[PDB]
Amino acid sequence: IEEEELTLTILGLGISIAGGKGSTPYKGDDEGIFISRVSEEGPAARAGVRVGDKLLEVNGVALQGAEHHEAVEALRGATAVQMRVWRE
Amino acid sequence: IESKV
């Protein structure tokens, strides 16, 4: 299992997100924003989003190195969510 | 922090 970029398209949304610059990391040394939880009955599940996916872009909004609140706001303001992620 | 979006 190594890294692979994917775009996931979602239609709450049953994902919890963790991490971000200046925030408690999700794992080891990484300050990225991650999918911490995926509830089996959400549009993100049928879109294929997976726990541990690192968020890179939400509808053009770049989240690489963004703070937590940035990702929260970007996600709520996005019907269609072209969600670019890095997955191991 | 975990937010449910």
Residue numbers in the entry:
A (entry chain A): 722 to 732, 737 to 803, 805 to 814
B (entry chain B): 257 to 261
Give the exact sentences the study uses for this entry:
Scribble is a highly conserved regulator of cell polarity, a process that enables the generation of asymmetry at the cellular and tissue level in higher organisms. Scrib belongs to the LAP (leucine-rich repeats and PDZ domain) protein family, and features sixteen LLRs (Leucine-rich repeats), two LAP-specific domains (LAPSDa and LAPSDb) and the four PDZ domains (PDZ1, PDZ2, PDZ3 and PDZ4). The influenza A virus NS1 protein was shown to bind to human Scribble (SCRIB) via its C-terminal PDZ binding motif (PBM). Examination of the SCRIB PDZ:NS1 complexes showed that the NS1 peptides are bound in the canonical ligand-binding groove formed by the β2 strand and helix α2.
We determined crystal structures of SCRIB PDZ1 bound to NS1 ESEV PBM (A281-R219-T220-I221-E222-S223-E224-V225), SCRIB PDZ1 bound to NS1 ESKV PBM (A281-R219-T220-I221-E222-S223-K224-V225) and PDZ3 bound to NS1 ESKV PBM (A281-R219-T220-I221-E222-S223-K224-V225). The NS1 PBM sequence ESKV from the Hubei strain was originally identified via a phylogenetic analysis that identified a mutation in the NS1 protein from the H5N1 virus; the avian virus-type PBM sequence ESEV (which affects virulence) was replaced with ESKV. The SCRIB PDZ1:ESKV complex revealed hydrogen bonds between Ser223ESKV-Ile742SCRIB PDZ1 and Ser223ESKV-His793SCRIB PDZ1. It appears that the conserved His in each domain found on the α2 helix, PDZ1 H793, PDZ3 H1071 and PDZ4 H1170A is an important position even when this was not obvious from the SCRIB PDZ1:ESEV structure, whereas in the SCRIB PDZ1:ESKV and SCRIB PDZ3:ESKV complexes a clear role for this His could be identified. The PDZ1 mutant H793A abolished binding with both the ESEV and ESKV PBM. Our ITC analysis of the ESKV PBM revealed an interaction with SCRIB PDZ2 (KD = 9.5 ± 0.7 µM) as the tightest interactor, followed by SCRIB PDZ3 (KD = 12.1 ± 0.9 µM) and SCRIB PDZ1 (KD = 30.0 ± 0.9 µM) as the weakest interactor. SCRIB PDZ1 displays a higher affinity to β-PIX (3.3 ± 0.3 µM), compared to both NS1 ESEV (21.4 ± 1.7 µM) and ESKV (30.0 ± 0.9 µM) PBMs. SCRIB PDZ1:ESEV and SCRIB PDZ1:ESKV superimposed with SCRIB PDZ1:β-PIX with RMSD values of 0.77 and 0.75 Å, respectively. The −1 position of β-PIX N645 forms a hydrogen bond with S741PDZ1, whereas the NS1 PBM does not interact with SCRIB PDZ1 from the −1 position; instead, the −2 position S223 appears to be the important position, forming a hydrogen bond with I742PDZ1.
